[PDB]
């Protein structure tokens, strides 16, 4: 009976049933609360397409991918057993229309990926992938996997709000101290009251009633009592929060001893209803609440222009009261424009019941919103920290419902992160992630990993995500639970081997080279499963290790270059699968940046641009420790310079390139691929403000493809465009080329393409910093991307700013590159 529950906890890495850290039943309520939407999407999903999870897009095939077709004919090699004859097909041919060549089903060779269902083959991703890298398709006639295998193991006062601060206690502690109690909505403070400062001892009692000005009825659902502890010109030392209105719409009464979080700023961690579970080392405030529920267009020219100017500004542009007052007065005009929504609701006086009352009548008449073409940027904006109203938030999630599954993957990581801004554990977002995850094994797979990532290294949100993940797991299907169990075990095995090996070092001295391979062989025998799914690439099953190819690195974090046999024999390759396990750095950042990169690709796709970024798979699996996809046939720019020498010579790259190209035909492809690659990463890193990088952190493949790595990480350069890069482009110091302008051609197109989604990138960056960079979440750090994207400026002016940047690199050659040495 209850072994299943233990099974689930082992998958999550957290005990959902435990109640050592609550003070109410929200977590347990949300467990119950989620059952229905679990059951619903379970029920309504077609078990056959769920088994095959046909990864397909409904976008156009871009102008770069058309040009690479053999005139409305594509070839698909079908494999019998030891013989494989090919077939002629046209893009619009459904799998059924090809399958007929004279029940059974198609499958890609090596991967657990299927070309089935009612879409042409040009809509399946695998096909688009083969076309892109310049590859030939390879299917295999196979029996459809049994749905049986997926089956789920089925079953009002007018009083001013007063809070009494009794006191704070801390088990181990040098000036005075006060407690700051803020009523809060969004990041907005509605009302604030401090205590008088007492001397700071291991226990400080006050017994004060902090009476607030705001009334009880005027409290809005989502309001947070934010209690904060400062000591003095002060500093914040501890924070903690308490929802003033609970999950049943009930006002919060009674005695609350709350354990608090420390510090080392718009960190998402500061918003949490989670109390610290570490009761021994942690500060704790003590309070008493005593109170009942709450219930459920013809303007001047000049103004409308002022209004339209406002709707038209970027999400990070601050609204003045003047601005806010205007948006609110002209509610109904502003409602006509979907792009006003963030700003409009950011102009609502939330600590005022009649206004919120009005705000809802406004929401009830959202005919224009409910019809508008889905905009992820605009949608995202309404799920950030600036919005705490369920009905506001729920209209954002309404618009997400309409995303096809392909687009869900593009945004899942950040949609998962955005759960950190929800006031309550049960939410339209959380549930939308749940169902969309249960409807699609691919979404479901990464959801698991994305939740487990955060559960494993966030105390502030593990309790919530734990619950969400449990609800996923209880419906994902026994096959996947078996799949997950495998994956957890394998990376739990390897993470030990990664940590134990790190301790025996100080470069890889003799005996340590074996000690690794010792355990890799020892922990291969009767323990390591014979086959597991690649967490960053859930097509690829991997089994047998390549013990002869596994390594460790000289650099001080001692990662594990591992290599694997693909367990699937029908794979027509013999390139191993390459994984790196790394400890020390937080790969949550790397995930985010990489995901953003993928979003820039997809943007560029919408404007028929390809910049052949290489955004490799990388998953945070636990605390300070995760895995990374290994891109085959790739070296750093550093070693290309180390192999020659010291400092740096210009020729070496192209030398390295032509020497790694066989034919001249395949060579120039590289110089081209390199010009495209270099363009993207220069554009991309500038926008994200991560362009100033030492060249051992930039890489290139033996087919010309540049790409940055390690995003965990004296005057500056906008981005890495060093002479050796320019050398491949046929230029020197103060010259130009047939390619270099094409580079500048692509760059300025790329940068302006990224600008045609300013608002979107802005909000993602802003969300990224908040939810995944606990170091740089200051207004100013976030504001970088406005400048970097030259908000407000016209196209032509933005180019002559970007091109300036290129000619700040030209002006510096190796200045900063050398400077990192020390
Ligand atoms: C670069 C490099 C190199 C390397 C390869 C050839 C020439 C110069 N350096 N060798 C390694 C050997 C190991 F055993 C472990 C790590 C590396 C390594 N690192 C270190 C690091 C992990 C730890 O933090 C520092 C950065 C890292 N991150 C990403 C990737 N890649 C490359 C292949 O495609 C996947 C992404 C490699 C890689």
CATH topology of the largest domain: Phosphatidylinositol 3-kinase Catalytic Subunit, Chain A, Domain 5
Strand fraction band? 15-25%
N- to C-terminal distance? 62 Å
State the secondary-structure class. Answer: alpha+beta
Shape: globular
Residues in helices, as a percent range:
40-55%
- Unique bound compounds: the ligand Cc1c(-c2ccccn2)nc2cc(F)ccc2c1N1CC2(CCOCC2)c2ncc(N3CCOCC3)cc21
Spatial order of strands in the largest sheet? 14-15-16-17-19-18
CATH architecture of the largest domain: Orthogonal Bundle
Gyration radius (Cα, Å) is 28 Å
Question: How many separate domains?
Answer: 5
Using the coordinates above, name the CATH class of the largest domain. Answer: Mainly Alpha
In DSSP terms (H or I, runs of 4 or more residues), the helix count works out at 30
CATH homologous superfamily annotation of the largest domain: Phosphatidylinositol 3-/4-kinase, catalytic domain
Number of strands: 22
Give a short account of the largest sheet: 6 strands, antiparallel
PDB class: transferase/inhibitor
Keywords: inflammation, cancer, p110, C2 domain, leukocytes, kinase, p85, phosphotransferase, Transferase-Inhibitor complex
Assembly: monomeric
Entry title: Crystal structure of PI3K-gamma in complex with pyrrolo-pyridine inhibitor 63
Could you provide a short overview of the structure?
The protein is α+β, with helices and mostly antiparallel strands and 822 residues long. It has 30 helices and 22 strands.
């Amino acid at each position: 009976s209850q072994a299943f529950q233990r099974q689930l906890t082992a998958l999550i890495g957290y005990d959902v049933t435990d109640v050592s850290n609550v003070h109410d039943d929200e977590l347990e309520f949300t467990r119950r609360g989620l059952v229905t939407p679990r059951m619903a999407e379970v029920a309504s999903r077609d078990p056959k397409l769920y088994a095959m999870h046909p990864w397909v897009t409904s976008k156009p095939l871009p102008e770069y991918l058309w040009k690479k077709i053999a005139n409305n004919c594509i070839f698909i090699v079908i494999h019998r057993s030891t013989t494989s004859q090919t077939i002629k097909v046209s893009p619009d041919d459904t799998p059924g229309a090809i399958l007929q060549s004279f029940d059974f089903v198609l499958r890609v060779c090596g991967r657990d990926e299927y070309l089935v269902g009612e879409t042409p083959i040009k809509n399946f991703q695998w096909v688009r992938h083969c076309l892109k890298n310049g590859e030939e398709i390879h299917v295999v006639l196979d029996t459809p996997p049994d749905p049986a295998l997926d089956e789920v193991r089925k079953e009002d006062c007018d009083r001013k709000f007063r809070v009494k601060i009794r006191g704070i206690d801390i088990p181990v502690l040098d000036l005075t101290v006060f407690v700051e109690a803020n009523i809060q909505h969004g990041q907005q403070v509605l009302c604030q009251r401090r205590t008088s400062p007492k001397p700071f001892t291991e226990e400080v009692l006050w017994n004060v009633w902090l009476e607030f000005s705001i009334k009880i009825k005027d409290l809005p659902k989502g309001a947070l009592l934010n209690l904060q502890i400062y000591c003095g010109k002060v500093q914040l030392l501890y924070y903690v929060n308490l929802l003033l209105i609970d999950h049943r719409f009930l006002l919060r009464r009674g005695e609350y001893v709350l354990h608090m979080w420390q510090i080392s700023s718009f960190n998402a961690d500061k918003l949490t209803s989670a109390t610290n579970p570490d009761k021994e080392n942690s500060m704790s405030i003590s309070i008493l609440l005593d109170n009942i529920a709450l219930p459920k267009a013809e303007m001047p020219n000049q103004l409308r222009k002022q209004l339209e100017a406002i709707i038209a500004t970027d999400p990070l542009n601050p609204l003045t009261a003047e601005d806010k007052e205007l948006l609110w007065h002209f509610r109904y005009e502003s409602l006509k424009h979907p792009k006003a929504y963030p700003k409009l609701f950011s102009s609502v006086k939330w600590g005022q019941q009649e206004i919120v009352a009005k705000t809802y009548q406004l929401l009830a008449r959202r005919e224009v919103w409910d019809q508008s073409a889905l905009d992820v940027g605009l949608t995202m904006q309404l799920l950030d920290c600036n919005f705490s109203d369920e009905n506001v938030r729920a209209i954002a999630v309404q618009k997400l419902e309409s995303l096809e599954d392909d687009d869900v993957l593009h945004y899942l990581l950040q949609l998962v992160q955005a759960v950190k801004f929800e006031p309550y554990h049960d939410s339209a977002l959380a549930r939308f992630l749940l169902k969309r995850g249960l409807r699609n094994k691919r979404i479901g797979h990464f959801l698991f990993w994305f939740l487990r990532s955060e559960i494993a290294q966030s105390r502030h949100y593990q309790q919530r995500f734990a619950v969400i993940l449990e609800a996923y797991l209880r419906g994902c299907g026994t096959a996947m639970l078996h799949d997950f169990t495998q994956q957890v075990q394998v990376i739990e095995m390897l993470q030990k081997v990664t940590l134990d090996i790190k301790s025996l070092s100080a470069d890889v001295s003799s005996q340590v080279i074996s000690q690794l391979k010792q355990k890799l062989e020892n922990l291969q025998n009767s323990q390591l499963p014979e086959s597991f799914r690649v967490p960053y690439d859930p097509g690829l099953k991997a089994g047998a290790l390549a013990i002869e190819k596994c390594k460790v690195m000289a650099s001080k974090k001692k990662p594990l270059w591992l290599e694997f046999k693909c367990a699937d024999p029908t794979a027509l390759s013999n390139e191993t699968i390459g994984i790196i396990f790394k400890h020390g750095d937080d790969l949550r950042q790397d995930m985010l940046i990489l995901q953003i990169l993928r979003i820039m690709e997809s943007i560029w796709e919408t404007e028929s641009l390809d910049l052949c970024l290489l955004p490799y798979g990388c998953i945070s699996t636990g605390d300070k420790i995760g895995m990374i996809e290994i891109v085959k046939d790739a070296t750093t720019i550093a070693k290309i310079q180390q192999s020659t020498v010291g400092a740096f010579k210009d020729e070496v790259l192209n030398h390295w390139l032509k020497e790694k190209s066989p034919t001249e035909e395949k060579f120039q492809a590289a110089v081209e691929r390199f010009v495209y690659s270099c363009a993207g990463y220069c554009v991309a890193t500038f926008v994200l403000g991560i362009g100033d990088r030492h060249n051992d952190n930039i890489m290139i493949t033996e087919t010309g493809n540049l790409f940055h790595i390690d995003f965990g990480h004296k005057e500056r350069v906008p981005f890495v465009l060093t002479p050796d890069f320019l050398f491949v482009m046929g230029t020197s110091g103060k010259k130009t080329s047939p390619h270099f302008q094409k580079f500048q051609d692509i760059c300025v197109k790329a940068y302006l393409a990224l600008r045609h989604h300013t608002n979107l990138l802005i909000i993602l960056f802003s969300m990224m910093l908040m939810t995944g960079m606990p170091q740089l979440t200051s207004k100013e750090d976030i504001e970088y991307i406005r400048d970097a994207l030259t908000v407000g400026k016209n196209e032509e002016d933005a180019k002559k700013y970007f091109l300036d940047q290129i000619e700040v690199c030209r002006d510096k050659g190796w200045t900063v590159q050398f400077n990192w040495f020390l």
